[PDB]
């Protein structure tokens, strides 16, 4: 039942949430690490619940804080959608022990503790994978916890600090000490916190929730090994100077911290030239399909292959492809397409697949085991079946050896299965390796004729010619943008090239062994390339004993671009 409401205020993070990055002792040294932390002076949602959408996202990790003293808060739940369709975490605190479970429980709109039952938390557990029991963690005070999940490993750090009567988060420092690690290894996008109410009875609670980011931190250990101060590396340029110089004091002078560049924003698409469209209507529906032993082959190039209109040409069910996807055929671009249309038996429809053997395969039609393409088969019982029985269709039956991939046999003769020569007469041990298909409208599903069209695509080895109508949106003329050109990945600010690339020229090499003019195949336009604006950053500041004010100087760039 819905009986709880919640309000959200907001506050600053000040400087909190620094946990011992590694369980290693040091002394009187400064250590620089890179890990997940709470960036300083960040955004905090002060939640106040009173008796609601407890769907709080999890992101990468969570920092939780509370100041209640009645032990009203208990346990946590983690998951991605929190239904019975997926697993979820069941870390529940208790005055005696602590229990963690992973199963596809069914949580209601607001799980809670009856208080000592969890039926309202979840109806049942069906397919469970992990269980664990241990000693409980929770034992005028401020209680801080940090939970994270890295490489399928769930780690919790905690700290209980004493606080005076202060309204907001106190200043100073307080390290977090590790407590727990477990191997769960699931995706978790959000989390919920459980409350226990006696019976119900009115209650109130308040807490702070924050999210963490991967940053580089610097920490100062004292002579006993307890962290007393830390410095962020991405807060303000002075902090960057402190991180680079590796000290807590900066003297008067000028220092160099890092560089700056203009980031790319978009991407540029340059397809092959387009003038015409592929004639798909003359292959799938022509009132004629060649025999299986002598199959037709049509070459398709220099046109746009609209596979979407294929469904409107033949009454088939769906595509089946091996090296490509039916829905992704409008993006990939191929230099050549091959169409092979024929008629086979209903039970022989399953006989077209890599790594298969049959009478049709090794004697009529063979494809490489590395086939990259699609096959479309549809029944044609209303056109290739006659009351008297169709006789035009023939298929080979006897052959001396198996057919190689993409090989056809049309030559006819009298097959010999005896020592004596056939001598052109089909007598003893002399047969005809060509049998006519028996098609009738009264036959079964597996014996009805089926029209099969095989489309084979050639990968990007030659200049591409066949793919969908992708617009070559010109990359404006003054944008720091990346570009993908037929396998070449690059970036820069790119204008129109005034260079006179003679019709054969497609790429321009600079003095420094790199491209400075590129070519779009869609329209014969050559494009000029220059590097994106970039430079260095320096900091001018007096000694730290005087003031923290600094000045930032960008090298070689006027105040016109960032």
């Amino acid at each position, epitope marked *: 039942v819905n009986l709880i409401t919640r309000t959200q205020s907001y506050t600053n993070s000040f400087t909190r949430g620094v946990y011992y990055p590694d369980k290693v002792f040091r002394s009187s040294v400064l250590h620089s690490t890179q890990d997940l932390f709470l960036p300083f002076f960040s955004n905090v949602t002060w939640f106040h619940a009173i008796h609601d959408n407890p769907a709080l996202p999890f992101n990468d990790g969570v920092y939780f804080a509370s100041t209640e003293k009645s032990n009203i808060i208990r346990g946590w739940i983690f998951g991605t959608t929190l239904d019975s369709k997926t697993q979820s975490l069941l870390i529940v605190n208790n005055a005696t022990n602590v229990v963690i479970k992973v199963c596809e429980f069914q949580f209601c709109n607001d799980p809670f503790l009856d208080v000592e039952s969890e039926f309202r938390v979840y109806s049942s557990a069906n397919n469970c994978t992990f269980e664990y029991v241990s000693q409980p963690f929770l034992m005028k005070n401020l209680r801080e916890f940090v939970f994270k999940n890295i490489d399928g490993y769930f780690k919790i750090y905690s700290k209980h600090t004493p606080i005076n009567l202060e309204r907001d988060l106190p200043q100073g420092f307080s390290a977090l000490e590790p407590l727990v690690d477990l191997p769960i290894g699931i995706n978790i996008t959000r989390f919920q916190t459980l409350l226990a109410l006696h019976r119900w009875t009115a209650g109130a609670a308040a807490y702070y929730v924050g999210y963490l980011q991967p940053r580089t931190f610097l920490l100062k250990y004292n002579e006993n090994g307890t962290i007393t101060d830390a410095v962020d590396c991405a807060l303000d340029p002075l902090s960057e100077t402190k991180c680079t110089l590796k000290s807590f004091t900066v003297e008067k002078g000028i220092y160099q911290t890092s560089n700056f560049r203009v980031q790319p924003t978009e991407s540029i698409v340059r397809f092959p030239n387009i003038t015409n469209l592929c004639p798909f209507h003359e292959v799938f529906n022509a009132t*004629t*399909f*060649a*025999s299986v032993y*002598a199959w037709n082959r049509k070459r398709i190039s220099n046109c746009v292959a609209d596979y979407s209109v294929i469904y409107n040409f033949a009454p088939f069910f769906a595509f089946k492809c091996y090296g490509v996807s039916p829905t992704k055929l409008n993006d990939l671009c191929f230099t050549n397409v091959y169409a092979d249309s024929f008629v086979i038996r209903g039970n022989e429809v399953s006989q077209i697949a890599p790594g298969q053997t049959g009478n049709i395969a090794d004697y009529n039609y063979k494809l490489p085991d590395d086939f990259t393409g699609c096959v479309i088969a549809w029944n044609s019982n209303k056109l290739d079946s006659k009351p008297s029985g169709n*006789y*035009n269709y*023939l298929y080979r039956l006897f052959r001396k050896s198996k057919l190689k991939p993409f090989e056809r046999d049309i030559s*006819t003769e009298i097959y010999q299965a005896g020592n004596k020569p056939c001598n052109g007469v089909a007598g003893p041990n002399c047969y*005809s390796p*060509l049998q006519s298909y028996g098609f009738r409208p009264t036959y079964g599903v597996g014996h009805q004729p089926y029209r099969v069209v095989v489309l084979s695509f050639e990968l990007l080895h030659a200049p591409a010619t066949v793919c969908g109508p992708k617009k070559s949106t010109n990359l404006v003329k003054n944008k720091c943008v990346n570009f993908n050109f037929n396998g070449l990945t690059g970036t820069g600010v790119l204008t129109e090239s005034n260079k006179k690339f003679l019709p054969f020229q497609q790429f321009g090499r600079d003095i420094a062994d790199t491209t400075d003019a590129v070519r779009d195949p869609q329209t014969l336009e050559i494009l000029d390339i220059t590097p994106c604006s970039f430079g260095g950053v320096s900091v001018i500041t007096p000694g730290t004993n005087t003031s923290n004010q600094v000045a930032v100087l960008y090298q070689g760039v006027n105040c016109t671009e960032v």
Partner: nanobody
Amino acid sequence: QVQLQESGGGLVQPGGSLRLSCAASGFTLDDYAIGWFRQAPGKEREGVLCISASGGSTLYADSVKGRFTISRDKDKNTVYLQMNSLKPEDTAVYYCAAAGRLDLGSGYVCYGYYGTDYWGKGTQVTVSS
């Protein structure tokens, strides 16, 4: 696939000459017996000429023996019919047809008459008389 289309014809004086040819496109049968047929308005259609596919064994009709010359070319898969000494009784709608050979008693014998698998649109041959 298998489609038969004819060419030639028209109106000619008695004793003239004509050439009629029907082209067989898409044919795939190994052995078959194609035949030519004519039908004057008011009479039943009947076979005219037919030759063997393997070697070209000439078979002619009594009424049109000698006057009707037939030739089969495998290069274009078409049958050429030559007409001469035309008579008023030759006025009919001429058709071309294709059918397979009869396989009875472990032998190869070409059979025409009725029971033809495919037929063409046909042409009209008229004698001025």
